[PDB]
Curated annotation (Swiss-Prot), chain B:
Post-translational modification: 4'-phosphopantetheine is transferred from CoA to a specific serine of apo-ACP by AcpS. This modification is essential for activity because fatty acids are bound in thioester linkage to the sulfhydryl of the prosthetic group.
O-(pantetheine 4'-phosphoryl)serine modification, residue list: S36
Listed GO biological process terms: lipid A biosynthetic process
Gene from which the chain derives: acpP
One GO location term (cellular component): cytosol
Positions of the Carrier domain: 1-75
Listed GO MF terms: acyl binding; acyl carrier activity
Organism: Escherichia coli O45:K1 (strain S88 / ExPEC)
Matching InterPro entries: ACP, ACP-like_sf, PP-bd_ACP, Ppantetheine_attach_site
Keyword Disulfide bond: no
Function: Carrier of the growing fatty acid chain in fatty acid biosynthesis.
The keyword Lipid biosynthesis is annotated on this UniProt entry: yes
Domain of life: Bacteria
Protein name, as recorded: Acyl carrier protein
Curated annotation (Swiss-Prot), chain C:
Residue ranges occupied by any Ketosynthase family 3 (KS3) domain in the UniProt entry: 3-404
Pathway of action: Lipid metabolism; fatty acid biosynthesis
Reaction catalysed by this enzyme: a fatty acyl-[ACP] + malonyl-[ACP] + H(+) = a 3-oxoacyl-[ACP] + holo-[ACP] + CO2; (3Z)-decenoyl-[ACP] + malonyl-[ACP] + H(+) = 3-oxo-(5Z)-dodecenoyl-[ACP] + holo-[ACP] + CO2; hexanoyl-[ACP] + malonyl-[ACP] + H(+) = 3-oxooctanoyl-[ACP] + holo-[ACP] + CO2; octanoyl-[ACP] + malonyl-[ACP] + H(+) = 3-oxodecanoyl-[ACP] + holo-[ACP] + CO2
InterPro entries registered for this protein in UniProt: Beta-ketoacyl_synthase (IPR000794), Ketoacyl_synth_AS (IPR018201), Ketoacyl_synth_C (IPR014031), Ketoacyl_synth_N (IPR014030), PKS_Beta-ketoAc_synthase_dom (IPR020841), Thiolase-like (IPR016039)
Description of how the protein assembles with itself and partners: Homodimer.
Protein name, UniProt field: 3-oxoacyl-[acyl-carrier-protein] synthase 1
Enzyme class: transferase
Alphabetical keyword list: Acyltransferase, Cytoplasm, Fatty acid biosynthesis, Fatty acid metabolism, Lipid biosynthesis, Lipid metabolism, Transferase
Catalytic residues as annotated in Swiss-Prot or TrEMBL: C164 (for beta-ketoacyl synthase activity), H299 (for beta-ketoacyl synthase activity), H334 (for beta-ketoacyl synthase activity)
Induction: Mainly activated by FadR, but minor repression is also conferred by FabR.
PANTHER family, per the entry: 3-OXOACYL-[ACYL-CARRIER-PROTEIN] SYNTHASE 1, POLYKETIDE SYNTHASE-RELATED
Length: 405, 75, 406, 71
């Protein structure tokens, strides 16, 4: 048969909460996670705001496994611990099991330890100050390598990278493993660190918000007429993707079923999206889905260009049946490699608890956004099918459609 | 602190064991669970702490807590 | 039913050749690509040997396209240019086609350009001296993003990273896209750059060869009793993975059919392989292949411990029916994220041309290696099924099986 | 005045449409990321410094040649 896939557990460490309960409270109240950053100012950048993880990680993970971990792997490790416990998976149910895998990736490893390794080499110590741990912290598959070992994953294990669509492709790839009958359980997610080494190059391109440094909570302002760039952010996320019959037999709590997954490419411009690729990506995820879309978690970066190209794609897909739209990035910032799994978790919390989080910081709706139902205040509503878009540098697109059973 | 207990402090936090388990005759590998990569970082933390430089041929000789104390005491 | 995947074209830029003709010549002769590196010595490293790409890339890529590229993306682009022509494909057939995708990743991204931007950020100029092309060059998805735009790919587009199993997982996930019926053509492969900013991290762990800096040609010596670490290398590779009926429709040249793909995780030690995961990975790829394995491209890489552990996994899977074994890394080195697709192309050329590349530099065969057919000299033989293994940090494994159509 | 050579290799033209009123966007097809690099490449040939709010106004080719003759 076709084999169906469901979500049986989730875990999140973002700028608006260290778990799904704290995230649920922030989503309802529309509380921002953007704060002032002294590190971004001392390094010489123009943007002084970020969506930081308000949590110290010193000592939370065992020494034998944290010695190889950068911040991206740490946030994803703490997220998977939550997802394992939320799914009720005992150790003998997911450890040393060939039918259990992991697909988690980051945007680009850890530039912090990349720069640290070169500084120690050229120094007076030489190789004596480099250390034998920079390789696992700086590589691209560090999130998957540092997590599959302590959790004793025996199935599939690799990392996916695709700019800001990163963790979205990981979830879609997990659904494919379940559909192909290769796996019964796949942990899917990702993480991202937050440092000046990685954020400074975004500022050199002129894509970060530099006009709202004195009021950080107003910097991320998606769909507003006075936007000037996205706010850098970090964190992690993890979802438990399970085969349907495997989850029903063990009495698991099922959040939703992933009934659609789109993944296309623009193949036009390197920095500016075209729109045609996003339509095919969305239309691909809706094919075979009979129920309409109730809520749409847009990619919404809060950039002067990429914000309108997604609205034109949404308009062509639905036309007059415009679903409720809101961009949660206005609260949390842009977590890059972890944006796909974090926004899918926000959408699952909306579907689970029957509400729509608002797209905050909208003082004057942009003219090219009129006619759409952009929700600006928290609304209680029985949602059935939700959708989340994730676009990435290079024209790559990803879309997930989730529905209750 | 004495030289002996400054080395024992370093070994404790680098391998993840209690200070009581760090006795003199204890070896890093079979007693303190140090893998092959832990040995490299251990000699780096000793040579960052007493401001000494350890040749690699002698660093491979240091396999016990007493051997590390004897080297720092002799230099 | 189940859609079948075949290789209809290939391209490679490695340390033993800049196309499949040069590479074919080095394989039949046994020429090592390892040379002496003055940059590795100037930076203060203990290892002074590597497998570099002997090729000038000035003017081979357009300025509008190369400005976003790092060396890992340049080797993959030049490899994809050869694979498209080798497949006989025209832009009208693969450009602006939603059924044509691209899955190509790198081991990490580009440490050299990340370090260059940090030094400029802390320099006297500051943010103004960083430049606007550091993001595209230093990100982990640079290989796929810098390639999908010039070739106008409309299908799937992302990068897979899994240490030294990177480009093998890319090929495996390309096959899955065809099996699920989501794509007709997927370009799969990867690339890796070669610089001291990346190699000096492996020298800190002691994983590089430092005892043969005077005789670089015999530094990488897989299965020899006097090995002391792998030799770092770079390059790129790309294969055209295509659905069977679509390839037979346009009368394409088919190298071999991907009849098996294995992908497992050890979940034990992260720096030392376990062998148990390798046994499951080989059996999963051999599932359904009634024909025996004629040649096995081992991962090898001349590491002091991981060499003998892989051999025990081969004996457990094959028993008395051991296939011919040779580690091509003794010639080329370890290209990290590009090794999977490059060792897959080496196995394809050997299957296509009917021979076995030798495992060179073996002077004293080590223990527990006796009992297997480690082919030491170039043996001409008609093959029908080959196998290439690929392991990586984190206990991750990948295995591909290729068979002629008959 | 070797400015025409740098601009030609920076934008991807055989050095032809180099008039006073030639914009970089609609005449020379320069990306907005290229306009930042166009500035950058001018400092490599002559050691000079340009602020930020002044750079957005600069979108002419003859202005670059005249700026160089005066610096
Ligand atoms: Na979204
Ligand atoms: Na191999």
């Amino acid at each position: 048969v076709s084999k169906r896939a469901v979500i049986t557990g989730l875990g999140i460490v973002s700028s608006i909460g260290n778990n799904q309960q704290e995230v649920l409270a922030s989503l309802r109240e529309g509380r921002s996670g953007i704060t002032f950053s002294q590190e971004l100012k001392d390094s010489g950048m123009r943007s002084h705001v970020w969506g930081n993880v308000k949590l110290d990680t010193t000592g939370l993970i065992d020494r034998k496994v944290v010695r190889f971990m950068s911040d991206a792997s740490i946030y994803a490790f703490l997220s998977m611990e939550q997802a394992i416990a939320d799914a009720g998976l005992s150790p003998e149910a997911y450890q040393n099991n060939p039918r259990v895998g992991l697909i988690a990736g980051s945007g680009g490893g850890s530039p912090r330890f990349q720069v640290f390794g070169a500084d120690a080499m050229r120094g007076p110590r030489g190789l004596k100050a480099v250390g034998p741990y920079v390789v696992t912290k700086a590589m691209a598959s560090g999130v998957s390598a540092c997590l599959a070992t302590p959790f004793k994953i025996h199935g599939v294990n690799y990392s996916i990278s695709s700019a800001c669509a990163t963790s979205a492709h990981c979830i879609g790839n997990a659904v494919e493993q379940i559909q192909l009958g290769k796996q019964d359980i796949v942990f899917a997610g990702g993480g991202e660190e937050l440092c000046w080494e990685m954020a400074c190059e975004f500022d050199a391109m002129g894509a970060l918000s530099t006009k709202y440094n004195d009021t950080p909570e107003k910097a991320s302002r998606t769909y507003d007429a006075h936007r000037d760039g996205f706010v850098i952010a970090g964190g992690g996320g993890m979802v438990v993707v399970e085969e349907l019959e495997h989850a029903l037999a063990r009495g698991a709590h099922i959040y939703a079923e992933i009934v659609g997954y789109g993944a296309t490419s623009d193949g036009a411009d390197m920095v500016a999206p075209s729109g045609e690729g996003a339509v095919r990506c969305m239309k691909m995820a809706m094919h075979g889905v009979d129920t309409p879309i109730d809520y749409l978690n847009s990619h919404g970066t809060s950039t002067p260009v990429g914000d309108v190209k997604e609205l034109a794609a949404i308009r062509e897909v639905f036309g007059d049946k415009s679903p409720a739209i809101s961009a949660t990035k206005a609260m949390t910032g842009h977590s890059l490699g972890a944006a796909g799994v974090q926004e899918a978790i926000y959408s699952l919390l909306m579907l689970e608890h029957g509400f729509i989080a608002p797209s905050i910081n909208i003082e004057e709706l942009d003219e090219q956004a009129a006619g759409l139902n952009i929700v600006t205040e928290t609304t209680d509503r029985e949602l059935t099918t939700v959708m989340s878009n994730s676009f990435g540098f290079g024209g790559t697109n990803a879309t997930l459609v989730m529905r209750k059973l | 602190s004495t030289i002996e207990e400054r080395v024992k402090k370093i070994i404790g936090e680098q391998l993840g064991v209690k200070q009581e388990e760090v006795t003199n005759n204890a070896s890093f590998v079979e007693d303190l669970g140090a893998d092959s990569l832990d040995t490299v970082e251990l000699v780096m933390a000793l040579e960052e702490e007493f401001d000494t430089e350890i040749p690699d041929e002698e660093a491979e000789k240091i396999t016990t807590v007493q051997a590390a104390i004897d080297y720092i005491n002799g230099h």
